[model samples]
Target: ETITVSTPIKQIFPDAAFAETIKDNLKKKSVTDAVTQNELNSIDQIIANNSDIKSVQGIQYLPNVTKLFLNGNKLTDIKPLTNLKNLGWLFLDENKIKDLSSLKDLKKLKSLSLEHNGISDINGLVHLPQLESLYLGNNKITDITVLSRLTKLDTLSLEDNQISDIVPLAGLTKLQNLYLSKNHISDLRALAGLKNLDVLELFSQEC
Candidate 1:
């Protein structure tokens, strides 16, 4: 029953920095060594903040990973995380992740952060009804119609974008705190529908 899950760390961890993190977590001596499935299972969360990780090539091996923090990195592709349905909290801020279609399958996701990225679209998370907190500040988003029926959101941030219309956000009535500073919004009255909003941050000629 001794099967080599990944021979030569590159087979699983391509990013040198990520591999080093895993190696340190596993307490292994070198990347040339391979770990068993049971050994990889010991990892509960991959906290690689500011680790300069560019890709998540082999994170699926940790079947029980519920929390993943990869903030402040150089990640460009995260399609590898689509199958981690157990993920509850996922953070990927300060990266270059533009495509989010791979994250559509994470049904258990509650808190998601993607601030300061190159993202222009967020259609991937529209179907996730369990989402509680969402951060998308400093991106190139213009059309937010994709966020229409997500009423479970309590905190939402859309600062520093090209969004000029906020009528799409009117349906998110559960929002408590909303950030829309530094955008092209023309009507601050559109937020009247959000009666539950506790704190609002919007900067425009209308506000």
Candidate 2:
């Protein structure tokens, strides 16, 4: 006689009813049985983009998942992502996220994109010292003083925002690519210190 072992999905989604539903959904997306305990424990990347996934609750089981892409979804809450400590590259653009405090613990995160969202305050990103690339285009951000802490940033995009003063970006010497298009900035003095900048986009203002 042979006995079947429980899968990672079954273990994480203990509720029989919910587990079946999750399994069915994963199957429909061709991800069923592909996410086993061993696989989730060692996998470094998971790209489930355009899958119509609304929640990332069960994905917390993947302890070693470093890169994740959930762009172009209808997600509003991402609190479940707090458990992914090894996350490095995260993309959640075109979502409905408002608060980002859940990502404070992901210290290993290097690249993050939250474009076309409802984020106005980025104070939650101050603790991520390893962040190198950040995309915040098409948002309602005004103050960017919190980004001063991310000294390792190489690429930063703030296009289509409501910024007028760019004094906070003077210290980002490592910046290579900077985009500030569609803003109200009338000053270029703060950008003089960024000698490494290779690509820069700023809206032109009349004198």
Candidate 3:
């Protein structure tokens, strides 16, 4: 004989009373290892974590994962993801990453977060054809030259960086949201070119 539980207990009970009973039973069961493991598995599935990455180099195996988060690792080299052809969302905040050469392989990338890194240049990231959002706050970036090719970009965050000029952003016409808060920028002429922009966060004249 074979037995299988194909439906949830909630479906089996099908009422508020069952829900309340299940909740009370769960409260009585306390936190078991199986419950914690299941919760962790659910989290992993939600975040699309298919790899066991402990460092940047471990990301070489997860090519099909759509989202990846590797923050606070102090990683400077990003060469492991050179083969992630299907990567869409990438988070590498609070690392030591300075160069972005390895991320060129992720052609399907949409959202990227590189906040609090040591990045100064935005080169090698211009070819991301599907890129829409970018966050580079609290970095050492001074020149915005590499962003010239990201014409499809919609949202950009460069807060707390060392940027002073807004000239390179004039060509990005599709931009909707732009953040340059806490920078040393004084000129506002480049902002005029952002005809489609809806939100613009910048430093005040008193700062």
Candidate 4:
């Protein structure tokens, strides 16, 4: 006996063009062909890494999508992905994003990368309780007190920033790998009781 799987948008467009566009984007990111979907709504993840994509306007159709990667793109405005409440892993590294207010609603986010961007504020990440890993390297961030609430963080990278005080990090006892390189830190006392910390990078600092 043979079996066939059903998708959500099989009847929406009925044409291969719309679904093929999403599939082609995933193909460019080197995703295996083992997972094939004929409908746009069937896709649960979209990896468009290094695809030169500047916009994510029509991605709202995939309401069930949990993972999304758009690294190495020309994207600056990510307000389009604000409605994806199920997103757990989102990668927007090496983009031009300056505002992160659009991501405040992604409560299920576990891993989020925004490295090499122009972000200066991180108050948008206060409500993410499920976040485990976060990468914000090479940004313009200074105040990190907002991160004290994210006690579940295991891996965090704040390399190449303007931060000097790390007192807020004392609350994150679960941190295993932390990178604070190229900063203005002068104290190692804040990292005293973090027994879980296995890898720490603080190159070019006063302490």
For residues 20-73, could you state the per-residue lDDT of candidate 4 as single tens digits? 446574453322222324444566888777776767755665677889987888
lDDT of 1 at 136: 95
Model 4, stretches more than 4 Å misplaced?
1-21, 25-38
Error of 2 at 47 (Å): 1.0
Best by lDDT: 1
Q: Model 3, residue 24: displacement in angstroms?
A: 27
Kindly list the per-residue Cα lDDT of model 1 for residues 57-76, writing each as its tens digit: 88877777889999999998
Spell out the clash pairs found in candidate 1: none
The runs of at least 3 residues in candidate 3 whose Cα sits more than 4 Å from the true structure, single-residue gaps closed, are 1-54, 204-207
TM-scores for every predicted model: 0.90, 0.84, 0.71, 0.82
Candidate 3 Cα RMSD (Å): 10.8
Tell me the tens digit of each residue's lDDT in model 3 across 1-207. Answer: 111323243332233342233334334332211122222122211131222223443233333556766665545677776777777888888777767878887888899999988778887677675689999998988888878778889999998888888788998999999999888898889888788999999854223
Q: Which of 2 and 4 is ahead in TM-score?
A: 2
RMSD of each: 2.5, 4.9, 10.8, 6.3
Runs in model 1 lying further than 4 Å from the true structure: 1-10, 204-207
lDDT (Cα) of model 3:
0.66
Give lDDT: candidate 2, residue 88.
92
Report the C-alpha lDDT of model 2 over 1-207, residue by residue, as the tens digit. Answer: 111344556556444443444565445342234345554465567666665666776666668778888788777888878878989999999988988988999998999999998789888898787899999999999899888888999999999888888898899999999999988889889988999999999865222
- Report how far off residue 39 is in candidate 4 (Å): 1.2
